[PDB]
Design a protein around this ligand. Structure first.
Ligand SMILES: COc1cc(CCN)cc(OC)c1OC
Length: 263
């Protein structure tokens, strides 16, 4: 099956990134520590969540797993997906701040800033993903629907899709536009950086955008077609966790050398 390839690529990429950060003396700085935290989140998703979804695919969408375990499963899904999304948003904000005024960025570029950023993004993701365990375990009807298990809370879906992908999307759009308008004011290094930023932004938009917009159209509005579209797009969005470890690292020569050495 095609879904078994994605889990293999996710875990392979995150192992390679983790060993590249940990076993290299030159890559150990704040940015690669934030990237390591992102890789940790993507590994936790691709280890605890995606094989369960593959078992759901194989089992005909009746839930073999315990019912109570589905609510915590949705909790882990939302937790790790939000963690990845605001990790990318914080990466984009840090890139814009470091590119617009590089002198003032180096005055406060210690490891304390990176630790505070990691703490902030994980606390934000935990707070966003907080109600699913508390309300889903008390009432089983809020997470189950005719054997299949999905978020049946419409208002929670709207709020947690507006605060997790419609604030970060506009933040990333604004920072990408401003970073493009900042580097163009000045040179193959800057053009290569612009190409990399554009590739990253458009890959993120292409990978993640259809899932949230069809999730919104599922609730705000033919049910089988929308359900199948959400079914395909939630697996398309899982492919982004196997792409961010590669794209954010392979543009460096040291990362390419380390990945060729370790394999
Ligand atoms: C918070 O954003 C979400 C992120 C995912 C990631 C799914 N792989 C699923 C959701 O609903 C279950 C979300 O809330 C609507």
């Amino acid at each position: 099956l095609l879904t078994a390839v994605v889990i293999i690529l996710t875990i392979a990429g995150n192992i390679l990134v983790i060993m590249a950060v940990s076993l290299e003396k030159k890559l150990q700085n704040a940015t690669n520590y934030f990237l390591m935290s992102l890789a940790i989140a993507d590994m936790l998703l691709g280890f605890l969540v995606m094989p369960v979804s593959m078992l759901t695919i194989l089992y005909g969408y009746r839930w073999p797993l315990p019912s109570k375990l589905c609510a915590v499963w949705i909790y882990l899904d939302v937790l790790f997906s939000t963690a990845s999304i605001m990790h990318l948003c914080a990466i984009s904000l840090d890139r814009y701040v470091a590119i617009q005024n590089p002198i003032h960025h180096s005055r406060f570029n210690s490891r304390t800033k990176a630790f505070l950023k990691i703490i902030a993004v994980w606390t934000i993701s935990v707070g966003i993903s907080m109600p699913i365990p508390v309300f889903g375990l008390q009432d089983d009807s809020k997470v189950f629907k005719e054997g299949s298990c999905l978020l049946a809370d419409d208002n929670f879906v709207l709020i947690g899709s507006f605060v997790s992908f419609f604030i970060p999307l506009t933040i990333m759009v604004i920072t990408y536009f401003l970073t493009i308008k900042s580097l163009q004011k000045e040179i193959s290094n800057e053009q290569k950086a612009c190409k990399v930023l554009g590739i990253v932004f458009f890959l993120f938009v292409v990978m993640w955008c259809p899932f949230f917009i069809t999730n919104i159209m599922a609730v705000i509005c033919n049910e089988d077609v929308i359900g199948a579209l959400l079914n395909v797009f939630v697996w398309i969005g899982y492919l982004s966790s196997a792409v961010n470890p590669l794209v954010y690292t392979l543009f460096n020569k040291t990362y390419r050398s380390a990945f060729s050495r370790y394999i």
